[PDB]
Amino acid sequence: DRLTQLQICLDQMTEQFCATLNYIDKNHGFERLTVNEPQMSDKHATVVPPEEFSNTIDELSTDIILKT
Amino acid sequence: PSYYYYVDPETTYTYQQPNPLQDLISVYGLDDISRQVARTNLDGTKAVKLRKSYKNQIADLSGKFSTIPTRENGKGGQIAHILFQNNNMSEQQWREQLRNRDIALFQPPNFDWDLCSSVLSQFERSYPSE
Amino acid sequence: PALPHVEINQVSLALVIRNLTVFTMKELAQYMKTNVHTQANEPNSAKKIRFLQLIIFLRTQFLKLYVLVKWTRTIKQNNFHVLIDLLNWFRTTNMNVNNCIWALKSSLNSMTNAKLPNVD
Amino acid sequence: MNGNSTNNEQLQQELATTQDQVASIIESFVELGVSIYDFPGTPEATKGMITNLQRNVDRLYKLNVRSNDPQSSLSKVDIPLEVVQYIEDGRNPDIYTREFVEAIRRSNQYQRGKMHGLKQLRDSLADKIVDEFPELKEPVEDIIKRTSPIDNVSNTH
């Protein structure tokens, strides 16, 4: 049972890698390389506030570390 | 130090070619397009809003043009595919039969102008207009 | 920097000029050969309204050619193929991250058979 | 680059004179159109129409044989299908250019957002790895140094 929990934890922790990559690929935004260039977005992209975006990145990393 | 697996100090990674961090418009010099059809001038003010149709590029003709020739008015036709169809002697010689390879549609029997004159001579007066 | 060049679904403007000329003058020859003879079903008034409709058609097609070549005057450096290759490269690069994600998912799916369960 | 500069100069000259030729064709079109609309039926009017067809055919002759001319960038200039169907739809092709170059900037900014979000994930996870496991300080510093190399295509904007 203990090795069973170990295998479960490895599978879930690799799935945590997958889910972290999923969120960071789908829920990012747009930023300014320079201030002169125009900024725009569409309805098909999930625009999120950057501060809570960084908060979710931090809590995903803490979940990865805690699973480790 | 402690070695860890597939963490190799001599293995190095470079940036993408081209790098999407930079403005690839400026990298390949598309600044002329960007500042020629930018919605705003690059000093903080709004530029002129260009029109939806091609009135600006058909306004330099003196003709009967008051409306817009579109798909839905029944005056135009779909010529895109016919528009898209496709087919010693030195380079110069090869190029004048390249220039002369299409002239065969210009003379009779394809475009007999005596027959053109005969059909155009049958035209009577006036045109029925609503 | 090098870009992957694509030559699909693109045509040369010499070819569009040649194709437009052969289309309009094949249509002119066809109208001549169709309207050689005059009958009761096709009077000369029908011939003249068909000729007027044909020249309005040619008017429209050559006006759109005029707009096309006006649009070609807008590009100065003739780098529209650089534009196209840049955006196809952009599609490849926007797809690489999802491809890496799907590669990790395939690595995940490879692990389903590869365990050793609790002993019975 | 001298060859590209000079051949683009004949691009501009060739497009301008084809503007002239196509406009002359349209002017011939407006005059035989008004000939159809107000035809008096006279033989002089018929011969004027015949000469109108003559001048239309020779203008098409000139521009077609110049589309087959080797001393031409008519073939080197490239045309796609979306702009020609967009003009056939009756809509202004500079909007097509605008939308396409704006799509360039959209994809550039979207991929840059991917890169910066991935960098935020990378350095946050690296800092938390260092905080949790003190024996992983050197491998994490090596990984960050290797995945943040010397900038040759990032210092310039």
Contact A4 C118 (CB under 8 A): yes
Spatial distance between the Cα atoms of D149 and B15, rounded to a whole number of angstroms: 8
Burial code (b: 16+ CB inside 10 Å, e: under 16) for A34-53 equals eeebeeeeeeeeeeeeeeeb
Give the residue from chain D lying closest to A58, CA to CA: D124
Residues 6+ apart with CB under 8 A from B14: D149
- At C44, the amino acid letter reads N
Give the residue among B21, B18, C85, A34 at the shortest CA–CA distance from D110. B21
DSSP-assigned letter for residue D135 = G
Helix A50-67 with A2-26: angle, nearest 10 deg: 160
Does C6 reach chain D within 8 Å, measured CB to CB?
no
DSSP string, A7-68: HHHHHHHHHHHHHHHHHHHHS-----SSSSS-----SSS----HHHHHHHHHHHHHHHHHH-
Contact C77, B29 (CB under 8 A): yes
User: Alpha-carbon distance B75 to C61, whole Å?
Assistant: 10
Closest CA to A29 of A63, A53, A13, A64: A53
> In which residue are the tokens 């590669």 written?
C103
> For residue B123, which of D52, C45, D31, D34 has the smallest C-alpha distance?
C45
Look up residue C99 and give its DSSP letter. H
- CB atoms inside a 10 Å sphere around CB D88: 22
Nearest CA in chain A to C115: A7
* Number of residues in chain D: 157
Q: Which residues of D touch B124 (CB under 8 A)?
A: 39, 41
CB D112 to CB B63 under 8 A?
A: no
Between the CA of residue D137 and those of A63, D142, D144, what are the distances in Å? 20, 9, 11
* DSSP secondary structure letter of residue B125: S
Q: Largest alpha-carbon pair distance within chain B?
A: 103
DSSP 3-state of C11? strand
Q: Which of D53, D64, D84 is opposite residue B116, by nearest beta carbon?
A: D53
Tokens for B103, please give them: 């002239």
Residue among A3, A14, A25 whose CB faces C101 most closely = A25
Q: Please tell me the distance from the alpha carbon of residue B69 to that of residue B78, in angstroms, as a whole number.
A: 12
Residues of A in contact with D113 (CB under 8 A): 28-31
> Which of B16, B27, B54 is opposite residue C67, by nearest beta carbon?
B54
Instruction: Spell out which residues of chain A touch residue D117, defining contact as CB-CB under 8 Å.
Output: 24, 28-29, 53, 57
Helix, strand or coil, per DSSP, at residue D57: helix
Beta strand pairing call for C10-12 and D78-80: antiparallel
Which residues are CB-neighbours of D87 under 8 A, at least 6 positions away?
A: B54, C64, C67, C68, C71, D93
Per the listing, tokens 């496991």 go with D133
Q: Does C62 touch chain D (CB under 8 A)?
A: yes
d(CA D35, CA D48): 9
Q: Which residues contact D145 (CB under 8 A, 6 or more apart)?
A: none
Rg, Å, chain D Cα set? 31
Alpha-carbon span C72 to B97, nearest angstrom: 28
Which residue carries 């725009």 as its tokens? Answer: A40
Structure tokens at C90: 């952009």
Chain-chain contact of B82 with C19 (C-beta, under 8 angstroms)? yes
Method: cryo-EM
Q: Among the residues of D38-155, which ranges form H helices?
A: 43-67, 81-88, 93-132, 137-146
Rounded Cα–Cα distance for residues A38 and D106 (Å): 10
For residue A50, is the peptide bond before it cis, meaning its omega torsion is within 30 degrees of 0? no
SS3 D44: helix
How far apart are the C-alpha atoms of A27 and A37, rounded to whole Å?
A: 22
- Report d(CA B117, CA B111) in Å as an integer: 11
Gap between the Cα atoms of A33 and A63, Å rounded: 31
Q: For residue C18, which residues of chain B lie inside 8 Å, CB to CB? A: 102
Residues 102-131 of D with CB under 8 A from C: 103-104, 107-108, 110-111, 114, 118
* The token pair that represents C77 in the structure block: 């450096």
Q: Is D32 exposed, middle or buried (0-12, 13-18, 19+ CB in 10 A)?
A: buried
User: Is the Cβ pair B95, D142 closer than 8 Å?
Assistant: no
CB contact under 8 A, A33 and D117: no
Q: Could you tell me if C44 and B127 are in contact, meaning their C-beta atoms sit under 8 angstroms apart?
A: no
Please identify which residue in the block is written with the tokens 């050689």.
C36
Q: Which of C18, C69, C77 sits opposite D18 (nearest CB)?
A: C69
A-C C-beta contacts closer than 8 Å: 25
The H or E element that residue B83 is part of is helix B80-84
Residues of chain B numbered 16-75 and touching chain D (CB < 8 Å): 17-26, 30, 33-34, 37, 39, 50-54, 56-57, 60-64, 68-72
Determine which helix (DSSP H) or strand (DSSP E) holds C51, and give its type and residue range: helix C44-74
| Spatial separation of the C-alpha atoms in residues C57 and C23, rounded to whole Å | 12
